[PDB]
Amino acid sequence: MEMEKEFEQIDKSGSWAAIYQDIRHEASDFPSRVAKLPKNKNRNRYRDVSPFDHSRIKLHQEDNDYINASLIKMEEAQRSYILTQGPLPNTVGHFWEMVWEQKSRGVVMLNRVMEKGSLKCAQYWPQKEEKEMIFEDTNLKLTLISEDIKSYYTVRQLELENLTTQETREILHFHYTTWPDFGVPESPASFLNFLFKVRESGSLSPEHGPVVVHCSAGIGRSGTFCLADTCLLLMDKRKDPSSVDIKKVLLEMRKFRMGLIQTADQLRFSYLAVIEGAKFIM
Numbered sequence: 001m002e003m004e005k006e007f008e009q010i011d012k013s014g015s016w017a018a019i020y021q022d023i024r025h026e027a028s029d030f031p032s033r034v035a036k037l038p039k040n041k042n043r044n045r046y047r048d049v050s051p052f053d054h055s056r057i058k059l060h061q062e063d064n065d066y067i068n069a070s071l072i073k074m075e076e077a078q079r080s081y082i083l084t085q086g087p088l089p090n091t092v093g094h095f096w097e098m099v100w101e102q103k104s105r106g107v108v109m110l111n112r113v114m115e116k117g118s119l120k121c122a123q124y125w126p127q128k129e130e131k132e133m134i135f136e137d138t139n140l141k142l143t144l145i146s147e148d149i150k151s152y153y154t155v156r157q158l159e160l161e162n163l164t165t166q167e168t169r170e171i172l173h174f175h176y177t178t179w180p181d182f183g184v185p186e187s188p189a190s191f192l193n194f195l196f197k198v199r200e201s202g203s204l205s206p207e208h209g210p211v212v213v214h215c216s217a218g219i220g221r222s223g224t225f226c227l228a229d230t231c232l233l234l235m236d237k238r239k240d241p242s243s244v245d246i247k248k249v250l251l252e253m254r255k256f257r258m259g260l261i262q263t264a265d266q267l268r269f270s271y272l273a274v275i276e277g278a279k280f281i282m
């Protein structure tokens with residue numbers, strides 16, 4: 001079926017939970033043996049969210065190459081994404097090592113450091129120009145260059161230096177700051193505006209490594225971001241945009257990381273975002 005009228009048909013019939021449970025039942029199951037090794041316990045935020053072995057990002061280190069991060073490679077859309085958990089106190093150096101080694105231009109953050117009165121990720125970037133951060137375990141330096149605070153999101157320019165080679169690179173930090181502590185946004189308008197700002201920066205384009213996108217677990221809000229982006233790109237590429245099937249795209253993405261889209265409300269919000277976005281594109 002088309003999307004907008006399939007949408008109204010699920011609303012009128014109140015069957016979002018049944019649709020979402022079908023997706024959970026059909027989703028791929030692949031091994032995640034490296035994630036579960038005892039030496040990696042303090043590298044995982046949640047015991048039930050792990051990268052598959054076949055798609056995990058490897059650190060360029062011989063001691064321990066493990067990070068909780070996955071490469072989502074979308075063949076028809078010609079887009080790739082790295083989805084990862086919010087960094088932990090003992091993985092902030094690994095996180096920036098990955099950004100460096102994978103040649104990423106942009107980092108997309110969809111959570112606040114504290115939500116619901118608890119810490120959802122480490123403070124992993126500097127908040128003042130004159131107070132830079134050094135990660136001694138991976139030999140990197142990170143400096144805040146500029147910050148632009150808007151009503152729904154903040155964009156930061158950062159300098160990442162590999163202290164071993166003295167090479168430097170400019171990284172863009174796109175921080176969506178207004179996702180509610182509970183539920184999903186009422187309108188997709190600010191989320192879509194944010195997606196378009198990430199696109200306009202070049203961070204999603206083939207001349208760079210894959211964008212790094214995270215929330216707390218790296219599957220819910222993060223899944224909504226890449227699902228909406230890929231569906232909108234396919235609607236622009238194909239002769240028949242009504243052929244784009246958001247459930248099929250989501251199942252394709254779940255071949256590369258488990259659990260993408262965590263609730264039926266996130267699934268409905270993803271439909272809403274793609275529907276409204278397709279009208280603005282034209």
Ligand SMILES: O=C1O[C@H]2CN[C@@H]3CC[C@H]([C@H]2C3)N1Cc1ccccc1
Nearest residue numbers: 192193195196232276277278280281
């Ligand atoms: O829904 C939108 O809100 C607009 C505000 N105005 C800009 C033009 C594109 C717009 C957004 C930025 N879109 C559609 C869209 C959004 C993301 C990706 C692909 C298409």
